[PDB]
Every structure is written in structure tokens, then in C-alpha cells.
Amino acid sequence: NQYYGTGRRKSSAARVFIKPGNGKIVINQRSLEQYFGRETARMVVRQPLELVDMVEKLDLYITVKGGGISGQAGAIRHGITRALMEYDESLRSELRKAGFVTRDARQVERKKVGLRKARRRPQFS
Amino acid sequence: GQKVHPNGIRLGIVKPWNSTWFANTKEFADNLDSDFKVRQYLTKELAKASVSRIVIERPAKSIRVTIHTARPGIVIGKKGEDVEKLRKVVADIAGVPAQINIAEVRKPELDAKLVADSITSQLERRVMFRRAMKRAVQNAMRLGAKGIKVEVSGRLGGAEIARTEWYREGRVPLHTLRADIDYNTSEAHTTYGVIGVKVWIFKGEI
Amino acid sequence: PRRLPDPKFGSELLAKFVNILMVDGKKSTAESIVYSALETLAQRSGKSELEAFEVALENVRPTVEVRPVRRNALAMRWIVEAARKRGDKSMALRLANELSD
Amino acid sequence: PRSLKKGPFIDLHLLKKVEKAVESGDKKPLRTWSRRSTIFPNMIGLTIAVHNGRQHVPVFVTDEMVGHKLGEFAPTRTYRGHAA
Amino acid sequence: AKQSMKAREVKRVALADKYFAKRAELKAIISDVNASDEDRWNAVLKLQTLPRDSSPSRQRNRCRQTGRPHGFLRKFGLSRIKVREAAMRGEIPGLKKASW
Amino acid sequence: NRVSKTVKGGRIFSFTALTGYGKAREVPAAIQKAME
Amino acid sequence: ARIAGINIPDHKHAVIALTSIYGVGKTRSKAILAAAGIAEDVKISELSEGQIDTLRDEVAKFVVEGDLRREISMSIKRLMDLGCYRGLRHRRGLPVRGQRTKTNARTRKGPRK
Amino acid sequence: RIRIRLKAFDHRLIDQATAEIVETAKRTGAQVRGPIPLPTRKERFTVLISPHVNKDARDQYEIRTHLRLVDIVLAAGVDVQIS
RNA sequence: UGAUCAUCCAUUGACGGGGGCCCGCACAAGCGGUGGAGCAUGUGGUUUAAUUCGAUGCAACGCGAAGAACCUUACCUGGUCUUGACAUCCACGGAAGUUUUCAGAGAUGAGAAUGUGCCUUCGGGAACCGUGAGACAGGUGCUGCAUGGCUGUCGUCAGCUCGUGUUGUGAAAUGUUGGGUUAAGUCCCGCAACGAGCGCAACCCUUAUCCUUUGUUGCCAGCGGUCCGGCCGGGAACUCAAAGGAGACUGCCAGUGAAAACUGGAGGAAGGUGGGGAUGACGUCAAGUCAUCAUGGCCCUUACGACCAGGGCUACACACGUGCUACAAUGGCGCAUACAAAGAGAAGCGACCUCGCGAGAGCAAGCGGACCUCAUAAAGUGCGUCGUAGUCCGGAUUGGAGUCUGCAACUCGACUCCAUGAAGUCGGAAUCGCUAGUAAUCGUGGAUCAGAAUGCCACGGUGAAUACGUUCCCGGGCCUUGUACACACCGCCAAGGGAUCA
Ligand SMILES: CN(C)c1cc(CNCC(C)(C)C)c(O)c2c1C[C@H]1C[C@H]3[C@H](N(C)C)C(=O)C(C(N)=O)=C(O)[C@@]3(O)C(=O)C1=C2O
Ligand SMILES: CN[C@@H]1[C@H](O)[C@H](NC)[C@H]2O[C@@]3(O)C(=O)C[C@@H](C)O[C@H]3O[C@@H]2[C@H]1O
Ligand SMILES: [K+]
Ligand SMILES: [K+]
Ligand SMILES: [K+]
Ligand SMILES: [K+]
Ligand SMILES: [K+]
Ligand SMILES: [K+]
Ligand SMILES: [K+]
Ligand SMILES: [K+]
Ligand SMILES: [K+]
Ligand SMILES: [K+]
Ligand SMILES: [K+]
Ligand SMILES: [K+]
Ligand SMILES: [K+]
Ligand SMILES: [K+]
Ligand SMILES: [Mg+2]
Ligand SMILES: [Mg+2]
Ligand SMILES: [Mg+2]
Ligand SMILES: [Mg+2]
Ligand SMILES: [Mg+2]
Ligand SMILES: [Mg+2]
Ligand SMILES: [Mg+2]
Ligand SMILES: [Mg+2]
Ligand SMILES: [Mg+2]
Ligand SMILES: [Mg+2]
Ligand SMILES: [Mg+2]
Ligand SMILES: [Mg+2]
Ligand SMILES: [Mg+2]
Ligand SMILES: [Mg+2]
Ligand SMILES: [Mg+2]
Ligand SMILES: [Mg+2]
Ligand SMILES: [Mg+2]
Ligand SMILES: [Mg+2]
Ligand SMILES: [Mg+2]
Ligand SMILES: [Mg+2]
Ligand SMILES: [Mg+2]
Ligand SMILES: [Mg+2]
Ligand SMILES: [Mg+2]
Ligand SMILES: [Mg+2]
Ligand SMILES: [Mg+2]
Ligand SMILES: [Mg+2]
């Protein structure tokens, strides 16, 4: 038995396959600490399992594509929480109260005509 | 201030395209230029024959020109004489086989292009502009337009100072994307110079 | 107008501090400087890294009356501003020396 | 600069001009608009009247000139200072 | 654009097509690794003696309707102005106002 | 009798015709109102 | 050390210290050191006296210092004597390589008169 | 294999033309592997709209070239490449 | 009266420093800039044979130009042509066209060969050329203050009006004001108004969640191998692709309110307009554009038209605007090593491989593309080094040597190599942008384009700070009041430096 969840964050997409065990984390055929360098990334990936108190009770094979380090870590977290809700649906409310079940919909606002970026206007004199 | 073209903004929403072919980049510009020369030829030849719209398809090695005309008898002619000899020139221009189809404009008083052309025709006969404008608005509302706006701009009555004058009747909701607003323009070439006519006809929301 | 915990100590006050120190989005660069500074601080003081950081803030925190969110915001901004001015070689040590003082 | 593979550019009309000047042994100035033509060794000792846009500027060719373009020796813009 | 300037573009297109293969041949000698210097020298002196207007780089893309030499767009063969007019009349297939 | 109301950026010229007493931006409409 | 009339800084790495010679940049420096067979990052103080003689040898292969300054000076002097466009730009103290002079060109022109 | 690539500027038009080839191939007893929606090319263009100056006044246009593949083991302006 | 009653050496507006009530990165709070430096770019000026023309407070000045070496090109100098470079018409000559010769900067002129076909009533040709004719062509010449069309601007601000009725002698007024409310003339209630139109909102595109369909060129969970590569047999789960659906309604709950609405809560991927875009009322400035185009009138017609080469648009005592790169250690350099999105491609994108220090070259696959190619993301992380110096900061400038595109890089390209190593040590007064995936910073792509971005248009990565508040500055909205203003305060008296009392 494997309990699945997709996660998404900016341009990242994360495929998360949870099943019970001792608590290995594979991310694109690499360990958590080889895949992600920054400790902000590695906390974020463990935040959901830390919350539910199932750190050493669930193995995790993760694939992730697109975006960057914080995006992919955010995509992964979304997928782990989505996988946990499939496993046990008592964990919904508490995971939502941690703010994890929300797909962070904030995206790069487009560049626009007459502006240097999305909002930065050229200098006036 | 300046406004979006009513036809353009509603393309693919409620209004269809007038050219409906497919092409890759290599054929695209040549197709546009041949379409231009087709539309130019027919607009000239059928100046008296009340042409509203010239739709061009290009199937497999072909051009299909559909002429939307209020006077199909004038365009078609006797034994389809006139259709067949337009079709030769189109086929010469396009450099491919051509079918000309003649579609009928049943209510020309509701066709924005025909209404605009009528006004510009009258303006070039030295008909008073206010009369021409009022007649257009009345005709369209009689024949069941849900609204009409007519704008005429330039040296109206050969005045020194150019002016814009417009009349509206009914609803003409230009910000409503689902509004079926037929919009077209025409130019009257007078002794005093160019007068522009713009006509908007509203035929309900879809 | 007209109308997140820091991952090493659980203090959002230090998460704010990272953000004030941060330049050009470079948050990981900022985090290293601050943590390096807090461990340095602890070695030359001898507390848990927040207590020394909080005692350092108490001396800067300004009291029209300043309300306590702006107070800690100002303190941290003044610390960072004061630290960046100095002629100690790295920002970590500039920050550690400024916090000590 | 022009690729070494392709070699040096001169205009054919000028290359023929300069050859005819050598053959005959004429020293009357050679009138040319070919500013872009490279100065070759067989130029040396000829005066080449190079167009600058309005006049043909004489260039007595020397050995230091070889490899440069002719138009280097015929300035196009006139400037004698501002406020003067 | 003036009628003469449109006619200059016609002349340049025609000569470019007339000499295209003769230009390609002479250039291919000049680019060649394995060639004599005499044949290369000859080939340089022949390429210049052809009409300048037979070079493709002397062509300016003009609006096919007006002849405007700025604001050209390759996919349509028209300037920005005549692209816009045609676009809004529904005469360019598939072309609609973009938002994203 | 042409009359006028000033507005921001100009004046609205209107017509009145003593036939009753009507008022309109066009002359014939003023007559129709005045006759009515 | 002293190499070609220049007191080479002792507390710098050999790669860096060698750039103090006029006519020797970063790539000619690494070329000298790898040929003479000294590591780039070894300090000039730490080298034994025979090794400096080998560094002095490899620099003699290059044109440097007052040899180069004469060489540079002669190139620029040829242009002006030639009276080519480049020479006129040298003469007048303006940009030589086609740059804007309407604005900018202050490196060549100096500060504003 | 009969491999059918359809392009069109209109998606209603392409799905119909697909449905002709597909259903027709299904009628015969040719094994239709299902119609595959491939990535739509959104080609974009930005033009100045003033005849003179006003650089910030622009229109942005797009041509959406829709793409369909159907494997087998029409309207004018639908493109068809069967290889 | 607006209307009414030689050389370098009383009415409607508008306005008030009159009043009241509001809004917007308007201020404040912040964060980063500009102004100083070097350089890029535009403009003024000056210069020039010419430095083509246009844009000029906000709303001209990296603006027309999405790309001036020739061409473009409109300008200058010189060389040239006169029914003509570009059309129709007529006579007469003549197939078109394919080679090369000479002169000339070329335009062009004088040749000399060669081909002399094909429709075809063997009747003719009409295809495209040339000489001649004068009806005409031609004009980026003038007038944007004769015009159309298109555009800027107030401003995506909440306005602007009409019918009918009612009031006033009338200009006009009412509705549209008022009490709340709203992003909103939004909605509600009151109301001599009752309705309606154009604006607001909605319909449209995109983005955030799910579902169904489909499954290659995309995909790899479970199987069976493995050259350990989704590489292969397979699987249809999942990512994704893109069609069709679902979803957000103040719908639900509670409180406040005289109803509209407001405030908080549930659920939910998303909550109050979810985020972003498209969308620009009546009008205002004789605003911009006769040089995109069109067009009245005027003007030129062996020239203000047309062809050519070379020059100029790249000038440089200088002034101004917009940018880029910096001044370092939150960094530079070296080595090693993670993670994108979006897009383009046939005379095009061009792999692998070989050669070159490198720009590149040679050879040569593949790909009209979810397949192939452009095409290693960079910031990051790790380790090493530099140790606060005008430095291992900076990369201007100049010399030498190349590469590539192109008939051609002298004037006047881009890039590389070696050398050189300027100013600059965070910028006076003043001034700009931004409220969140924003600013800041980091790369990436595209259009124009032979070549030629620090500009423009798009794309992701990392990713803040601060907002107590509306007193003040700027722009704008509503109501009221004064007025000697109506060209409308850039006016000709406002509290004029009688108003004011909320
Ligand atoms: C002599 N006058 C009265 C005048 C005369 C004519 C008619 N004849 C003009 C000509 C034939 C060119 C001599 C005119 O055509 C014009 C004007 C005024 C200008 C002023 C100009 C101004 N500057 C650019 C200089 C400005 O900022 C503003 C403004 N409203 O702010 C303008 O109105 C202008 O742009 C403008 O458009 C004018 C004219 O048309
Ligand atoms: C701030 N925008 C304004 C505002 O909406 C003005 N109405 C209060 C509005 O007024 C008009 O409609 C007018 O009546 C007068 C004209 C000059 O401006 C027009 O445009 C004016 C708009 O530009
Ligand atoms: K041009
Ligand atoms: K106009
Ligand atoms: K009264
Ligand atoms: K009324
Ligand atoms: K303007
Ligand atoms: K005109
Ligand atoms: K030039
Ligand atoms: K220059
Ligand atoms: K720049
Ligand atoms: K600047
Ligand atoms: K340095
Ligand atoms: K050049
Ligand atoms: K007032
Ligand atoms: K008074
Ligand atoms: Mg960005
Ligand atoms: Mg700009
Ligand atoms: Mg013309
Ligand atoms: Mg070109
Ligand atoms: Mg040196
Ligand atoms: Mg401020
Ligand atoms: Mg500056
Ligand atoms: Mg002005
Ligand atoms: Mg030129
Ligand atoms: Mg005007
Ligand atoms: Mg009102
Ligand atoms: Mg409303
Ligand atoms: Mg009311
Ligand atoms: Mg709307
Ligand atoms: Mg809630
Ligand atoms: Mg004007
Ligand atoms: Mg003007
Ligand atoms: Mg003009
Ligand atoms: Mg020329
Ligand atoms: Mg210029
Ligand atoms: Mg450096
Ligand atoms: Mg490209
Ligand atoms: Mg593609
Ligand atoms: Mg200095
Ligand atoms: Mg805002
Ligand atoms: Mg309001």
C-alpha cells in the first residue's frame, strides 16, 4: 500500500509516494540532504511529518520537477500533506491549521508594457 | 479618449474572422497579400452591388471567396455571367483555383458596412449630413436593431472648422463583449476633403 | 494608507533580523551571517543565543511613544545599520562585535 | 578587420588604376572614391586623390601606410574648435 | 513610402534572384579551405564587379501595402500600422487580442 | 433663439422656439415641443 | 624579490606579485610560473634565490617595462606621424575607436572645461 | 502505423476534424489509438498603435496554433499531415 | 451677456492662499535608486558641405526608429536622366531572355556573340522589351490651424447625459441632490420625479483546486529484464499536454446596521473584485501625426521628380533626460556541484566529432519540432584563496594580434586573445520607483535583424522592509459658498492673500 499526493508551488510540481517504514526520504533518486543544500528547504520537507508525529513511521519516495529550491521544497511539502490526508483524514484539520493544505497560489506577476518589470515604472523627471 | 475596435475585441468571442485559412510562417504573408489584392479587386468591381463582407477560405490548393451582398442579382448577373468572370480574376490574383460564392444580405439597413457606405454615397451627392444620419438611424430601428450609433466627422457642409457629429438610438454597449455589435466605417471623398463615417449596430447579446 | 519561525531557534524575532540584514533576496547568505554571529556572541558571553541577542536588543530598543513591534523593528534596523558601518572584516564579526557593544 | 582567410580588399577599378600607373610610369594623381580599398605595396610613390565626400584629398603613399585603408588619409568631417 | 523607393525594392529582389547562384559559387571559393590563392583572388575580384543590389543584405523589408521601412513584422509582411488595421477587421486568421 | 449653458471645457448651445415654449439641441425638436 | 627593475611584493602570491611588472598580466604571469615551475599561490618571500633567477629568465622571453613603454610609445607615435584618422584622434586627445564624443569621452577628454 | 498530425488556429474546428478522421477510422476496423492533445503554440506580437511616438501605447496579439495527433495501428483551415 | 432677464610637435461654468467630506505609492512609514564617477543612449546647443525630417511642461528627450557601415536615406558634395525609377493609352520597331568585351566610382554608354521560342481562327498574337508622342506620371514639397484615420492626456477617474413630467418670466433647474454604503452615479433608503442611454460591474483571456476524456514526441507507480539510461518489453497510475465539465455566490454561520452593506468565523485549493491582463464614458488640450497611409487647397514639373558613387545622420568647449557598470569581503578569483520558466528555427536552428588559448573553423547528424537544435540557467551550495588595499575591488582607455557577418567593417560593427589598468572609496541642493511573489537582485528567451542591445517586449529563480495615520505636497471626486473671471486666475475683484463657524 502506497498513499499518493501531488504538490505544487510557483512553477514546481512534486509527486510524493508515502508508505510505512523507518523514514527514508528519496527526492529524484537522491537523499534529502544531497538534493537540498539549504536547511530552510529541509525543515520545510519535514514540517508535515513533524506536525503529525510520524517522522520515523513513514518512508517517502518523492519526484519533483520545475521551479527552484524553495519552490520545490514548497511543492514537496504540499504533496506530503496531500499524501497524509489520503493515509489518515484525521490529520486534515491540524495540517490545515499549520497552513500546509493551502496551495500557495502566489506566482510571478507578468512584465507589462511601459513598466521595467511587473510594477517598477521608469524614472520620471 | 481612444476606443478599441468593436469587431477586433470580439473576435473568437461572438464575431468570426473574415479570413479563415491556416498557414505556416512561410505561406502566411503571401496569403495575407493575396487576400488583400482579392478584397481590393472585388470592393472596386462591386462598388454598386452593395458588398458588406468578403470572407476568404483557403482549402487544399484553393481560394473560396464568399461575397456577402445585399444585391446578389447585380453581383451574380444573367446565367451567372458576372460570378464566373470575377472568379477568373480572383484565380489569376490568388494564383490558385477559386470558387466565388454569393451570400445575400437580407436586411441591408442592419448591415453596418452597407449603412456606412449609403451615408458616404449621400454625402458625396451633397445630401445634408444630418438628414443622411437620421435616415440611417430610423431605418435600422424600424427594421429591429436593438440599437444604432452613427458618427460623421470632418468638414460637414463644407465648413472651414471640422467637427464630429453623432446620433444614437437604443443600446450600443461597447464594453459588453457578448454584445453582437456590427461595426464598420466608410470615407466620403468630398470637394472639401474626407468625411469619415462610423456605424455601430447592436443586434442583441449572445 | 487612507483606508514564520526561524528554523534554528524558533524565534521569529531572529527571522525578522535575517530579513533586515538580507540584501537582494539573498536569504541563505543572510542566515549564515546571523547564525555565525550568534554562536560567536555565545562563545564571548556564555548564554543561549537568544538571551544575549535579547539583552543586546534591550539596550537599543527605543521608548511620541514607540509601540513594541516598531521598537524591536527599530532596534534591529539600528543594530544592522550600526554593524555595517564598522571596520571589522566580515559582517558576521561586525554584527557579533556590534551586538556585544 | 577583414578575415585573413579572405585576404586584403581593394576595388578592381582601383587595382587596375594602380597597375596602369606603374606600367606607364605616370605620376598624375589617381582620382578614386574607393576609401575602403587597402593600401598595397605597389601603391608606394603614387599620389592617390581620395574622395572625402566633397573633394579628392591627395595621399602620397608611403611604406608605413601599407595595410591601412585609403580613407584613413582623407578626413570626412571638418572641425576647427567651438567658440573660436 | 515614395513610388521610387518601392521600385528600388523590386529591382533589388529581382537582381538578388538573378545572380543568387553566381554569388553562391564565387563566395564558396572564398570560404573554401582547400583552394588556390589565385582562384580566391579572382573570386574576390568577380564578386565585387556584380551589381551591388544583387546582394540580399541590400534589401529592406517594407510593408507590402504602404512601403513603410520601419515597424515591419515578418509573419504578416506588413508594418505595425497595417497589421493592426487588418487584425481588428478580422483579416489575419487566428490573430486576436492577447492577454495572460 | 439660440441659448447656451457653459460647461467644463466649453459651452452647450441649445435652441428655443416661441411658436408654447420648447427647448432642444436641434431646432425641429424645439418646434415639436413648443407646438405640443 | 626584484625582477626587471621592479621590487616585486614579498607578501603576495607569486601569481599576483608578478602582475606588478609592466607588460605582464594574469595569463602571462601563470605562463611564467608554470614554465619556471613555481606554484601560483606560493608567496614571493618563501622562494629561494635560484628560483627568482628562473623567474627573471622567463620574463626576458617577454617584452616588458621600458622595452614595452618604448614599443607602445612608438606605435602611437607612428600613427600621428602617419597622419591617419587614428593619429588625428591621438593628436587631439579624442576617442580613437569610433566612440561617442557628443557626451561621455571623459577618460580621453579629461574633466569638463 | 498511420500517424495523423492536425494543426488549426481554432480548437472547435480541430476537434471536429479530429472526430471525422477518428470516427471514420473507427467505422472501418482500423485500431485508433486515442486523439492526443499536443502543446498549443501561443505565438505573440507587440505593436505600437500610434502612427507617431507614444511608445507606451501598444496592442498585444496572439495566434494560438492548436495541435492534435491521432495514431491508427475536412474543414478548410484545419491542417492535416498524415505520415 | 457665455447665456438670461605650415602647425600636434439672477443662471451655468470656472476659479479662491473660502468651507465641508473623500480617493490614488499623493504624503507619511520603509526598501532600493537618480543627482557625484566611467560608459551606453536620446535631446538641446554648438559645429558642419550635410550633421535628413518629426516628437518639446506633466502628456518631447533608450520617443516615430522592432535595430543608420553600403542599402535603409528622406540630408550633403559631385556625377547624371527628362513622358521619366513607378502606371494607363497610341505609333513604330521587336520573342523573351543566356553568356561574356571595353570605358566609367558607378549611374551609364558603345559593343560582340547566343536564343529567336510558344498561344495560335497559319488568323494572330499577348507575354515582356526598346525608340518616339503628349495627354500624364512623380514629390518623405507646404498647410495636423482645411481633413479622415490612428494616438497621447485627465484616468479606468466615476463621471456624462437624454426622454417624458414638474418648477422658474427666462438663461436654466430637477432627476444626478440628501442619509448610509461601495473599488464604483456600487447598492439601499428617502425624494416631484419617473424611466432610459453612455460609462461602473458582468460576459472575455490568463493564473490557483478538482474531475472526466485521451496517451505520443510527454509520463514511470506496479510488474519482467537491463549495456543501470524510461535504455528495452511493458503500465495508463502519476507529472504533464488540452478539450469538456465542477468551483466562490457574501452562499453558509455569528455580530453590527434603520436596509444596503460592514466585521469576524466555518468549510474550502481559493473569500469577499481570490491574483494579473484585456476593456478607456461625454468630453478636454486648433495636443501628436499631411514623413505609415488616405485626403481639400497650395506649390514644384529638363525639377522641390528620377538614377549613381562617396560623405553625413556616429561631429564635440558644453547643458539636460533615460539607462548600464561600479566603488567591494552580504565580495572578487579558482575548483567542484544542485534546482527553472518561457520562447525561436528552413537560404533557418545546427548536435556529436576534429582543430584552434579563445572569438571561431572543418566535417556533418537531426529537426518545419512535447522527438532535433539554439541550450551548462545564474544567483545558490561546498571547499580553497585574497584580508580592507585604489586591493586578486573596478574595467574605462589605449597598443598589438585575431575571429565572424557582409560586394565592403577607414570614416562607422560585434566579438576574442595578449598587454594596458582611467575615473570611481556609496554621491550637494534636489529628485524617482515600489504595498507582495511586489521591490531588490539573479539569470533566460524573443521581436527588428546579413551583422550589429546596456533599449524594448516577455520568462522564470531567490525574495524583503514598511504602512501610526490624512496634518502637509501633487493629481482627482462630491457638496456648499464668494466672484468685477467666461480668452474662464496662465483670468480680469476669492477672506484677492465680506468670507469663515465644520
Ligand atoms: C502662433 N500660434 C498661436 C499658432 C498658430 C498656428 C497656425 N499656424 C502655424 C504655422 C503654419 C506652423 C506657422 C498653429 O497651428 C499653432 C499655434 C500655437 C502652437 C503652440 C504649440 C505649443 N508649443 C509646442 C510651442 C504648445 O505647447 C501648445 C499647447 N496647447 O500646450 C500648443 O497648442 C502647440 O503645440 C500648437 O499646437 C500650436 C499650434 O497648432
Ligand atoms: C478625473 N476625470 C475627469 C472627471 O471624471 C470629470 N467629471 C467630474 C470629467 O468631466 C468631463 O466629462 C466634462 O464634463 C468636461 C470635460 C473637459 O472633461 C470630461 O472628462 C472629465 C474627466 O477627465
Ligand atoms: K528609411
Ligand atoms: K487628427
Ligand atoms: K427666479
Ligand atoms: K427634463
Ligand atoms: K504631443
Ligand atoms: K495634403
Ligand atoms: K554613410
Ligand atoms: K563617433
Ligand atoms: K543604457
Ligand atoms: K544617469
Ligand atoms: K585591479
Ligand atoms: K564600420
Ligand atoms: K468651489
Ligand atoms: K472683500
Ligand atoms: Mg522577475
Ligand atoms: Mg521607455
Ligand atoms: Mg505615395
Ligand atoms: Mg538591412
Ligand atoms: Mg602588470
Ligand atoms: Mg516618503
Ligand atoms: Mg550620473
Ligand atoms: Mg504644451
Ligand atoms: Mg547611408
Ligand atoms: Mg491637432
Ligand atoms: Mg452631475
Ligand atoms: Mg450605474
Ligand atoms: Mg434619488
Ligand atoms: Mg468593466
Ligand atoms: Mg473565512
Ligand atoms: Mg497644433
Ligand atoms: Mg508639430
Ligand atoms: Mg512633415
Ligand atoms: Mg547612397
Ligand atoms: Mg541619430
Ligand atoms: Mg577584477
Ligand atoms: Mg531570434
Ligand atoms: Mg515551437
Ligand atoms: Mg582617484
Ligand atoms: Mg496600489
Ligand atoms: Mg462619488
Author numbering:
A (entry chain I): 4 to 128
B (entry chain C): 2 to 207
C (entry chain G): 2 to 4, 13 to 72, 89 to 126
D (entry chain S): 2 to 85
E (entry chain N): 2 to 101
F (entry chain E): 19 to 37, 49 to 65
G (entry chain M): 2 to 114
H (entry chain J): 5 to 77, 92 to 101
Question: Could you give the paper's own sentences about this structure?
Answer:
The ribosome is a major target for clinically used antibiotics, but multidrug resistant pathogenic bacteria are making our current arsenal of antimicrobials obsolete. Here we present cryo-electron-microscopy structures of 17 distinct compounds from six different antibiotic classes bound to the bacterial ribosome at resolutions ranging from 1.6 to 2.2 Å. The improved resolution enables a precise description of antibiotic–ribosome interactions, encompassing solvent networks that mediate multiple additional interactions between the drugs and their target.
For the tetracycline family, we included one pentacycline that bears an additional ring E, as well as two clinically approved third generation glycylcyclines, eravacycline and omadacycline, which were developed in response to increasing tetracycline resistance, and differ from tetracycline by having extensions on the C9 position. In the structures of omadacycline and eravacycline in complex with the SSU head at 2.1 and 2.2 Å, an analogous interaction pattern was observed to that of tetracycline, consistent with the high similarity of the shared tetracyclic scaffold. However, despite conserved scaffolds, some variability is observed within the conformation around ring A, which influences how the Mg2 is coordinated. This is exemplified by spectinomycin, where two waters are coordinated by the oxygens (O2) located in the nucleobases of C1063 and C1066, together with their respective ribose 2′ oxygens.
